[PDB]
């Protein structure tokens, strides 16, 4: 619950009082000026971001991740621009040099705490 799990409070603004759909379900009131929105998990929140962004303009939006210690986080975006768009600040992590075709065989990884792809 909220005293031990990371509540996700999504903060965003709009221009007109439209009506969207909650991920909990049903229609929501959608305060026109500015509205925050507590949720339960991140896929609900970015699924709501797809729910509103693919319909119309809801930019200047991001969930402040209420971790139960008390403070917030900020992820989508971080540099202010949309993630599949390309910004010159992001450092790529999570690559190897080639395809799966040069990944190591797991008998070369057996009895070691490695991966089947780090080489």
């Amino acid at each position: 619950c909220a005293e031990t799990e990371e509540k996700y409070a999504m903060t965003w603004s709009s221009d007109q009082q439209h009506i969207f759909e909650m991920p909990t379900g049903g229609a929501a009131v959608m305060n026109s000026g500015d509205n925050l929105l507590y949720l339960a998990r991140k896929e609900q929140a970015l699924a709501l971001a797809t729910q509103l962004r693919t319909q119309f303009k809801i930019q200047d939006y991001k969930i402040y991740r209420i971790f139960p210690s008390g403070e917030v986080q900020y992820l989508h975006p971080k540099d202010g621009v949309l993630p599949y768009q390309v910004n010159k600040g992001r450092e790529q992590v999570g690559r190897v040099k080639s395809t799966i075709g040069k990944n190591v065989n797991p008998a070369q990884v057996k009895f070691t705490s490695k991966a089947t792809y780090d080489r």
């Binding site: 229609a27 896929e43 797809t50």
Partner: protein, 741 residues
Amino acid sequence: QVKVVVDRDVVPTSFEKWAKPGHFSRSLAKGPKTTTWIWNLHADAHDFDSHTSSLEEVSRKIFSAHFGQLAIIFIWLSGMYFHGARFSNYVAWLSNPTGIKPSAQVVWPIVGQQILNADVGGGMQGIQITSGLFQLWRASGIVNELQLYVTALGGLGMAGLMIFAGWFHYHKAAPKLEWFQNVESMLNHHLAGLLGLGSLSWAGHQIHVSLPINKLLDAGVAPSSIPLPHEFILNRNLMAELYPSFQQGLVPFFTLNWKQYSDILTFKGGLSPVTGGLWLTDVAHHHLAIAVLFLVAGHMYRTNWGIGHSIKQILEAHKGPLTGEGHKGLYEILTTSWHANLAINLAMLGSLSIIVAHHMYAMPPYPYLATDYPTQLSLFTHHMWIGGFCIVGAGAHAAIYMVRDYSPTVNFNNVLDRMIRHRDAIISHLNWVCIFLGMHSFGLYIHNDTMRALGRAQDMFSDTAIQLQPVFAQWIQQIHTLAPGNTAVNALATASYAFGADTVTVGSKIAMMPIKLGTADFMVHHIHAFTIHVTTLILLKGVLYARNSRLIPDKANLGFRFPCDGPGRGGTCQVSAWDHVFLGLFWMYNALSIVIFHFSWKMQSDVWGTVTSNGAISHITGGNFAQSAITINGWLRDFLWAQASQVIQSYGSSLSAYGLMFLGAHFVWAFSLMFLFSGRGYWQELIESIVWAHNKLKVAPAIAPRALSITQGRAVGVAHYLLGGIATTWAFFLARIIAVG
């Protein structure tokens, strides 16, 4: 307002687009690079809200398609009237119905299978009917073969009018959507015009055909001295002998001296003691009551004349406090989304078919219907099974509404989505009721199973042991005994002889016996409430979690027939609103399999059988229900081991085709499990390991041979689990009751 705007020359009628399979879907007109295009061609053959979002073009497509369905139904009934005409022993069956078993289909003589032609009497053989057509023809008054031929040819005539009507209403005169959203007129003509004039005109057929004919056949007249229904209307004199109120004409009707029509119409109830059917005076009077009552019912919808309701001003007026907005939006939901209409009409259609089954076993409405027990069984069972499947169609098309055609702007704070605000509190209490009824409907059977197996039969739930006499059903059945003197004042007998007086026998065959309900019948009703609540759990979980669950919060972005999301969330197989319908079909098989296993074994123990000298009694199993339904070894032994014995020894005889459709249906049932358990991640490179063996011999198929998809690879497991599972009980049941009754 009400006006009919019809497009003319909508679609040209060449065979050009038949040469383009998948012309209809721009997602599927690419052509098959894989074999999944073959099955997606058929899975998108009737996704009419997936061809184009334009509801005009959709609505033309469906409304023309209905005429194709009615064309197949008129080909079907014209088939039944012709197989009644040329092939049946119906003319000989009309002489002595209790001796001659009904047969229409006369099997062609190829190797062996000419032995399926059962010598059922009438001088002519063939495989025995269980559909009960001869009872509806004796009720409808069809005398000789001529009306069966002519009514068959009229069946083909109406089939031609429905093919030509559907072609005419898609191609060269097809309407606009403003015709279709004119729904107060649609109810206004279906309540009044369809059902009103249907029941009224059918009262015309029964009064001017069936009442003289089934008075003469009730008097035992051979089918040669019976005059045609023709000859009862040239003169009233042949009917004033039979019913002396026809002599007064319509004059006591227009003076409202309806006491005079006690000859034609009455309120007696019960059964005819001679034919074993309902009194057609009561049935014709009944269709008059539906006549005047539905013609009253049709005129409550304002169309052009400013007199009547609109559905909008009705649904707005119920602005209840605990719902907030009231029913605002449902007239815009049900006139813009077809799938929601299909959910309601399949729910009420299916539950009507179940109601049909329960009203046909206990008030057998056709003459000599309760005499031949297979037609009494299989018209309970068949209408119970389609009456099942249509409720799963409600649970599917409600979800197809919720995934595709849901829009929160029209649907904001009303009665609908305020459920979805607390769908955790809906499905959680269905979860509790399912566990509570499972314990208290099947834990009682494990209890009696153990206590009978542990020897201590003093601790069972029998009448001798700790009893569970159904209090409420016996009390209201006792009210139904006390109806026709006290409350049904102008009645004579009860609503049925499943309720009240001593049994009705026709030809030493028990037509209907008062059913006794003690401490085993109780627990099977809790089976039924249990497995009904589980299908309600899966088919409300399939709708309230259709659009946006809390597991997967974008299902409308994924669709209706999507298989899954992935191994994430620890695995999200089988999570779509379609997959709950996949589950509710298995629970449909469970729930109706124990409905008919309650029916066909309580009424082989408590109702059916023969009667002997001095009115003495004899059931088929011989009262072997309440001492044996309480357990499962009594159920499986004393029902599925013992009643199988006439299906299993059926070789060398005319019942051996059920001995083939029994084992082959065990095969199809067992063959579904291959599709249910495995998945295409096996079969795809099993198949591709065979594609190596075609690439070696240059027999590579140009359409690439994929395996099935996931949703097809489980939909086919349903459609074999049900075909094999249903045809097992089909062959078991008809081979059981044909072998005795």
